[PDB]
Design a protein around this ligand. Structure first.
Ligand SMILES: [Mg+2]
Ligand SMILES: [Mg+2]
Length: 729
RNA sequence: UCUCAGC
């Protein structure tokens, strides 16, 4: 069965609304014009003189026609005149089909977008945000707009409506002031700017400052008008500065003026900042109890507005008034095997403290390592090392005095030279300490520590050695990371799938550097899933993932003198629409690449697609308060189709947990669905940078970290000597 | 890098 057993049935409730699945009499039609005018809007206008024969309730998408009632004649031929052409254009009617299951959705999304437009909602980006009731945050010139993201699809329980509250931050002030910050260019490159006088939301494409707002443009049959005059005529406002660089948008020569503009979306500066996130996230990160009512009061609003009320009764569909109520299951909390003893996770599924009191399973001993630092931070670094020697013996590690090396100063060449005169085979780890964060020196250093000289490093920033409180915990968080960078596993969980490799793939979208789309590739190399062989992929990915799979298979063979019987490939980084693309292109490549070795080697494969950015929300509930559900809750019925499941593994403190969507796009493994769901739950714990369950499984997040490291700082492939270790953490 | 129509 699709529904696995072995959990605990907890009453959950997702944010899906079951549309009334009785939408018949929706006969699709077709129109044929022996004058083939190549404009859908012109065709619609041409047939508009015959709208009385149908009614307002029609959908003419250029070629077809959707009507909630029998068309007047499925072979009727009328003559239509054109105010421009003047020809007696043919009018055609077709009894193509009453759509069964394919174009029903494409109709419902169109009419539902029309409905949401009737509620005075605007289309910004892809979803819909309100404008009457912003949530004022007048502390940063920010201003939030409530909004909703909706979709309708053929989920197993019929036709369901997705609905999840969104939020779109918009700048209270103007844009020219934002253009003051040029010298203290390539940033307004897709920034969704909107105006205020009408709240019409443009999307910007190209900026050429070679123009002035006083220029005139040929509009409305040779009537040149200047922007200063056009805007004062059409909106009765003035312009203070007459030299601002205009903004250009073109529908898929609209020259905007950046005094009436106002950006949406915090733009890399509020993004790279600790200040504004704590200010915004109090509102953006909505707790589940508020979100449930922000959902229900949307339905109370939707069943009161006149256009919204009438449109449903026109097409006949009855939108229900309360979210779904399913019966999810809660997988048992999983034991965490340490070296000597083991602790079960709490309901919170976090062992951040119990990992600081037990022994790691395999500790690599730091007999000889080094530290780099500056005069300004010599004392703090020395104390950090002195008490790092004090915290390792508790946790089962064993460290000794490092070759305490002082760089000359903070210039990057000094660090480069100091590393180059220091690297030797008789070495374990070089632990570097920087005064201030800067990607130039960081990248120039990590290239040397990850390409030229394969020495696993560890960068620390000076502010983190507070030497007041965040030193014991920082040392206990860096010792455990340094242990893993040396190929020593910390904790493990009983995974009863004997002799099965597990692979994890994720990609990193870059738009500037060639769009190479670095993709990581991480696979286990031991039957306990604690040591990961991590390679990388490069292409301008088709051919390199087969090479990485073959190399990882060889590596697993070397360690275990065997070959895996199963290969679970938790593919991630799929686009929102290519969820079937992998099921046809790369799965055949993975089956083909097995041919290099093996006596006709037959791995029982399973390619699982992992999706994070979804819009489902599983609210667990006991009573009448839809709270967050405890991590480890599986839902796979009446919400998913084609054998895929939703899993709540993350845990948050503020907000609603987003369950993660795993699609099983290839299943030859003979694994019962129960076992694969449980396994996908176990791999959640195995991330050695956060003791406790995380969003995606261990290999997927490992691969994401590796891909981000390669893309943002390395821009090459790491040395193949480092691969058997988790040099990336 | 202690870490999760409009112009
Ligand atoms: Mg993804
Ligand atoms: Mg790290």
């Amino acid at each position: 069965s699709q529904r696995g057993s072995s959990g605990q049935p907890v009453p959950v409730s997702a944010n899906y609304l079951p549309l009334k699945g009785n939408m018949d009499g929706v006969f699709k039609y077709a129109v044929g014009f022996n004058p083939p005018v190549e404009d859908i809007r012109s065709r619609s206008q041409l047939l508009n003189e015959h709208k009385e024969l149908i009614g307002l309730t029609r959908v003419f998408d250029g070629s077809t026609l959707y009507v909630p009632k029998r068309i007047c004649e499925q072979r009727l031929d009328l003559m239509s005149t054109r105010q421009t052409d003047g020809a007696s254009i043919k009018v055609t009617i077709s009894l193509v089909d009453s759509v069964k299951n394919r174009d029903v959705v494409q109709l419902m999304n169109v009419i539902f977008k029309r409905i949401l437009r009737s509620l005075k909602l605007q289309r910004i980006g892809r979803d819909y945000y309100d404008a009457n009731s912003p949530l004022e945050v007048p502390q940063h010139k920010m201003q939030l707009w409530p909004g909703y993201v909706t979709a309708i699809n053929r989920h197993e329980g019929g036709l369901m409506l997705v609905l999840d509250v969104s939020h779109r931050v918009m700048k209270t002030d103007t844009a020219l002031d934002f253009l003051y910050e040029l010298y203290h260019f390539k940033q307004l490159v897709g920034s969704v700017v909107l105006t205020r006088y009408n709240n019409r939301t443009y999307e910007i494409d190209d900026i050429a400052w070679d123009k002035n707002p006083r220029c005139a443009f040929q509009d409305h049959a040779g009537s040149q008008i200047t922007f200063v005059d056009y805007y004062k005529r059409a909106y009765d406002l003035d312009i203070t500065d007459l030299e601002q660089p205009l903004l250009i948008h073109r529908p898929k020569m609209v020259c905007l003026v950046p005094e009436l503009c106002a950006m949406t979306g915090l733009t890399d500066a509020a993004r790279s900042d600790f200040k504004v996130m704590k200010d915004l996230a109090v509102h953006t990160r909505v707790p589940p109890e508020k979100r449930a009512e922000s959902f229900r009061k949307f339905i109370q609003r939707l069943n009161t507005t006149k256009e919204a009320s009438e449109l449903l009764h026109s097409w006949g569909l009855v939108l229900d008034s309360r979210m779904l109520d399913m019966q999810g299951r809660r997988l048992p909390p999983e034991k965490i095997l340490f070296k000597h003893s083991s602790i079960v996770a709490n309901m919170e599924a976090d062992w951040s403290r119990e990992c600081l009191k037990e022994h790691v399973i395999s500790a690599v001993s730091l007999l000889d390592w080094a530290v780099l630092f500056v005069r300004k931070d010599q004392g703090k670094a020395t104390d950090f090392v002195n008490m790092l020697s004090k915290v390792c013996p508790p946790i089962g590690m064993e460290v000794h005095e490092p070759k305490m090396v002082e760089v000359v100063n903070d210039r990057t060449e000094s660090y480069l030279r100091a590393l180059r005169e220091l690297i030797a085979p008789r070495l374990q780890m070089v632990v570097i300490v920087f005064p201030t964060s800067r990607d130039d020196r960081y990248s120039a250093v990590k290239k040397l520590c990850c390409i030229e000289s394969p020495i696993p490093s560890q960068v620390l920033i000076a502010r983190t050695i507070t030497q007041q409180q965040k030193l014991r915990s920082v040392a206990q968080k860096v010792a455990l990371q340094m242990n893993a960078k040396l190929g020593g596993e910390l904790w493990a969980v009983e995974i009863p799938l004997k002799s099965c490799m597990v692979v994890g793939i994720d990609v990193y979208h870059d738009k500037s550097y060639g769009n190479k789309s670095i993709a990581g590739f991480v696979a286990s190399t031991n039957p306990s899933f604690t040591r990961w062989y991590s390679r990388t992929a490069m292409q301008e990915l088709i051919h390199e993932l087969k090479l990485c799979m073959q190399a990882a298979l060889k590596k697993y063979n070397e360690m275990n003198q065997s070959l895996p019987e199963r290969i679970i490939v938790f593919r991630d980084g799929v686009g929102e629409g290519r969820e079937e693309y992998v099921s046809e292109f790369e799965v055949p490549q993975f089956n083909s690449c097995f041919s290099i070795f093996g006596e006709n080697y037959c791995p029982k494969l399973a390619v699982v697609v992992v999706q994070k950015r979804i819009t489902t929300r599983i609210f667990g509930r006991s009573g009448h308060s839809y709270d967050n559900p405890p991590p480890g809750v599986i839902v796979d019925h009446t919400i998913t189709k084609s054998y895929d499941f939703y899993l709540v593994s993350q845990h948050v403190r503020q907000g609603t947990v987003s369950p993660t969507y795993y699609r099983v796009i290839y299943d030859k493994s003979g694994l019962k669905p129960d076992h694969l769901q449980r396994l996908t739950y176990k791999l959640t714990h195995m991330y050695y940078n956060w003791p406790g369950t995380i969003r995606t499984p261990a290999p997927c997040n490992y691969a994401h970290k590796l891909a981000f490291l390669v893309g943002k700082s390395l821009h090459r492939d790491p040395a193949h000597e480092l691969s058997d270790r988790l040099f990336f953490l």
